[PDB]
Design a protein around this ligand. Structure first.
Ligand SMILES: [Cu+2]
Ligand SMILES: [Cu+2]
Ligand SMILES: [Cu+2]
Ligand SMILES: [Cu+2]
Ligand SMILES: [O-]
Length: 476
């Protein structure tokens, strides 16, 4: 059998009333010939790409046709807390919520997904994620590849595992609370190892790591380079040529790759040094999708310059906030034990050389920031509006991977886990690596968030956030 074609999310724009309609619902999908109940936006699985324009307002009508509560968060969008869709943004089952997004940030690929309190991992694992394509005047002048689904394609990469009956096998338990939910099956826009037919010249890939817990590292099967043009929050100042591209959970990068006649190649993910993530088939390079060259010329350019990246300011005088991430030692030890018992030494490949005691020892609140498991009723602090702050985020005390994400902003990384950031990570980011060390970011919030609709800051290893590694904060 031939490989399925890469599914392409519909690129959705507003109607005459200026509205975009999103319906959240359950249906069936097929994986390896076996049906599974899945959830999607405007469909059975995953979701559309919502197209937004800087300086224009759109209204999104969100219909929850699930039988449980959910929320819809716009990861990477700089919007007020009231429309941010964090855990306080509840949409009742069978209900509708509408939000107006006043887009005011540069062109970027953002995304959206649920933020249901303590259930975000499950709801994403079930299928809910969509994309946001923000454009502005600046990006269109660059004449990058721009034909959606032809030479400009989104690539949402996710793992799942399935039970013998074919259903998605999700659990939030002591093991996954420590190391995350991960699986053995890799999906690319929902499909297993699809092919994408691309014209000769430049191919633009908008890469999203949509895994709950698995970090990825993209490369090509024949070692042709990737030219990074954009990060979470938009364009880099100029392209950055890489041979491999690590992507943390929830991160986006846009890359250009050359397509030449008669030479198909795969986009692959390389084994990572993260606990549990190098179990077969992920102990070796793993194909993500096959690029099939078409002998028709592609019109897109890779310009020498993309955008202007403003200078980092002086750091003296700016508020410094400490965010200490932590995991309960016993539940970290127990989750790791369970992982080692199940998979053996392979669960640490590539790394460096039973009774009820009550609610105090519950793994559901074992993960914390500044000694507190997330309390939705108590924002931990009030950040300044329109002022640069230096946020210092520490994972000293455990060796788990914490891609730390801050709502309401695109920031600049000053130190990523104890080193200056790589060039392609030095632009606009909404995620920073924290793993047994300390990161520092320079952040500014341009919009208000009240106690009732607070911004979140949390680990994007979703099972950590669901078991307490999140805080709320207000702005204004
Ligand atoms: Cu997110
Ligand atoms: Cu977010
Ligand atoms: Cu974490
Ligand atoms: Cu979030
Ligand atoms: O998030």
């Amino acid at each position: 059998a031939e490989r399925p074609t890469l599914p392409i999310p519909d690129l959705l724009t507003t109607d005459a009333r200026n509205r975009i309609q999103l319906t959240i619902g359950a249906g069936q999908s097929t994986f390896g010939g076996k049906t599974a109940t899945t959830w999607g936006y405007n469909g059975n699985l995953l979701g559309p790409a919502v197209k937004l324009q800087r300086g224009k307002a759109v209204t999104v009508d969100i219909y929850n046709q699930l039988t449980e509560e959910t929320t819809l968060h716009w990861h990477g969008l700089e919007v007020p807390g009231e429309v941010d869709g964090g855990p306080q943004g509840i949409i009742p089952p069978g209900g509708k919520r509408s939000v107006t997004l006043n887009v005011d940030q540069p062109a970027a690929t953002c995304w959206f997904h649920p933020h249901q309190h303590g259930k975000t991992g499950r709801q994403v694992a079930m299928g809910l994620a969509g994309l946001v394509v923000i454009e502005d005047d600046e990006i269109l002048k660059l004449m990058l590849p721009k034909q959606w689904g032809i030479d400009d394609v989104p690539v949402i990469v996710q793992d799942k595992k399935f039970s013998a009956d074919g259903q998605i096998d999700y659990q939030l338990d002591v093991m996954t609370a420590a190391v995350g939910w991960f699986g053995d099956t890799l999906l690319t826009n929902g499909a297993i190892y699809p092919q994408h037919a691309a014209p000769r010249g430049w191919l633009r890939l908008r890469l999203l790591n949509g895994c709950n817990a698995r970090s990825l590292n993209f490369a090509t099967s024949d070692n042709r380079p990737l030219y990074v043009i954009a990060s979470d929050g938009g364009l880099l100042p100029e392209p950055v040529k890489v041979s491999e591209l690590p992507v943390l959970m929830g991160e986006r990068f846009e890359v250009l790759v050359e397509v030449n006649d008669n030479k198909p190649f795969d986009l692959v993910t390389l084994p990572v040094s993260q606990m549990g993530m190098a179990i077969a088939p992920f102990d070796k390079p793993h194909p993500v999708m096959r690029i099939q060259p078409i002998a028709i010329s592609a019109s897109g350019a890779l310009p020498d310059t993309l955008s202007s990246l403003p200078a980092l300011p002086s750091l003296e005088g700016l508020t410094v906030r400490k965010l200490q991430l932590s995991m309960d030692p016993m539940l970290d030890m127990m989750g790791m034990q369970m992982l080692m018992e199940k998979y053996g030494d392979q669960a640490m490949a590539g790394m460096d050389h039973h009774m009820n005691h009550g609610g105090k020892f519950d793994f559901h609140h074992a993960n914390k920031i500044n000694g507190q498991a997330f309390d939705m009723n108590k924002p931990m602090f009030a950040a300044a509006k329109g002022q640069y702050e230096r946020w210092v985020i520490s994972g000293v005390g455990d060796m788990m991977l914490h891609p730390f994400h801050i709502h309401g902003t695109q920031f600049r990384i000053l130190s990523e886990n104890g080193k200056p950031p790589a060039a392609h990570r030095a632009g606009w980011k909404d995620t920073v690596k924290v793993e047994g060390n300390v990161s520092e970011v320079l952040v500014k919030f341009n919009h208000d968030a009240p106690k009732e609709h607070a911004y979140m800051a949390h680990c994007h290893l979703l099972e950590h956030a669901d078991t307490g590694m999140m805080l709320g904060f207000t702005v204004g």
